[PDB]
Amino acid sequence: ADTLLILGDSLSAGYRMSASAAWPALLNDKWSKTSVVNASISGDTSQQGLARLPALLKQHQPRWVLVELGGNDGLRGFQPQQTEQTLRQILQDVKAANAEPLLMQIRPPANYGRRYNEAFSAIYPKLAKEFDVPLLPFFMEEVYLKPQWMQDDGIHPNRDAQPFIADWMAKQLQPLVN
Ligand SMILES: CCCCCCCC(=O)O
Structure with a gap:
């Protein structure tokens, strides 16, 4: 009866x-x-x-909102501060809509500069603490360990991987959606 809204990028929309x-x-x-x-x-x-x-919230009135964003920010001329602030507004909107935000940890490519990588990654733990919300692990960490589940670009999970990602997410979300 309740609705889980997923606000994400290609990792959730599916790539190609x-x-x-x-x-x-x-x-x-x-x-x-x-x-x-x-x-x-x-x-x-x-x-x-x-x-x-805003439109999605007023339209779907979800009880929980899974936020999976930030992975594209780096390649789009964005600084950790910008990303952090953007996600902060996202969490605010969710709560203000009487919904429970579920933030997923995001980690940029190993080759994006430690300076940025450690700063980017730190954004999630901080926000999760600041708003006191669940912080799910980056599901792609498990996918990287299986080349047969990665597309050529070595960035997006393939078709074969979706079923496994689905079960993994179900397990992670289970205790969170009661
Ligand atoms: C290395 C992980 C960050 C990649 C996120 C994929 C973004 C998208 O295509 O829509």
Whole structure:
């Protein structure tokens, strides 16, 4: 009866595959118990996601909102401060909508500069603490350990990987959606 809104990028929308092939669709099929609305768009930055949020909240009135954004910010001329501030507004909107925000940790490519990487990654733990919300692990950490689940670009998970990502997310979300 309740709805879980997913606000993410290609990792949740699916890269070079249809939405129906993406793990959130498989998760929804696994759950008439809880409705999963996948509001993810490939290439979206935290800012682009924030821009769509207001309409989505008033439209779907979700109980929980999974935030999976930031991974594109670095390649789009953004500084950790900008990303942090953008995600901060996202969490604010969610709470202000009487919904529980579920933040996912994001980690940039190993080759993006320690200076930025450690600063970027630190944004999530900080925000999770600041708002006192669940901080889910970056699901891609488990996917990297299986080349057969990665597309050529070595960045996006493939079709074969979605079913596993779906079960993994179900387990992570289970205690959070009661
Ligand atoms: C190395 C992890 C960061 C990549 C996030 C993918 C972003 C997108 O395509 O929409």
